[PDB]
Design a protein around this ligand. Sequence first.
Ligand SMILES: O=S(=O)(F)c1cccc(-c2cn(C3CCCCC3)c3c2cnc2[nH]ccc23)c1
Ligand SMILES: NC(=O)Nc1ccccc1
Length: 258
Amino acid sequence: LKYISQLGGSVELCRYLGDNTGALVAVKQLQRDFQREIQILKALHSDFIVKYRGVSYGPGRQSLRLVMEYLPSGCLRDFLQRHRARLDASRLLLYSSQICKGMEYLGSRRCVHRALAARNILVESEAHVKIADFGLAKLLPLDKDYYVVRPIFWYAPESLSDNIFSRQSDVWSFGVVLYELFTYCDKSCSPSAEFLRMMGVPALSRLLELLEEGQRLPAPPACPAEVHELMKLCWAPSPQDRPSFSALGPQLDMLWSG
Ligand SMILES: O=S(=O)(F)c1cccc(-c2cn(C3CCCCC3)c3c2cnc2[nH]ccc23)c1
Ligand SMILES: NC(=O)Nc1ccccc1
């Protein structure tokens, strides 16, 4: 495990015979505890979720490291921004469907991802993406569909207000992911940029007022109408009115098909 460089807690690129011939891996370390993260990712087997490879130990064997596949093509956000000129609406719908299906898998395991955003979706290749960054992921109790704890423009209003997270706070987030995809993560119309135009006062305060009045992110000018409608659903004021990942999935698959 020879350190190379910083990819993102902290994630580091490492090369795993001594002859510098070993494969590259991504390695997460801290500097609480990601014992939970390791257990969650190890159980998950999906073509749309980054692949666990094992564990190793840190200095003195006092520390665990999480060993995962490294995707050099990097995060979807950067991929979109560089190559916007040559990625079509069909390819974005493909990405959307893949992400949706990984979220379904998570939901069936009572897993709240919480961090879902284009920056922690990885490009395995041009036509295949995988969900990563399980650092804030938390499993729901068997008897309860949310939790409470002690990046504002991705979070549902009840998360911002009352510190509630659920699978439906994830759905609000996935809506914001669709928005990232169909704006190719352009800085000029980022969630944060749109926010600053929507008031010409603390951000979080003003954001919660805007959301309460029903103001949402505008359709990307090049976005298919049916994808915009999905986004607005995902940003339903009440958690219970947002569609499930299971209800979204067919729509995006229907859209991608066409
Ligand atoms: O040098 S960069 O341009 F920043 C650069 C370049 C190429 C790849 C990455 C990268 C970033 N992360 C994580 C994912 C989200 C949160 C932390 C950062 C990766 C990457 C590659 N494989 C990975 N396997 C598991 C996670 C992971 C980063
Ligand atoms: N979900 C959503 O539309 N959020 C939002 C609204 C205005 C500005 C920034 C973010």
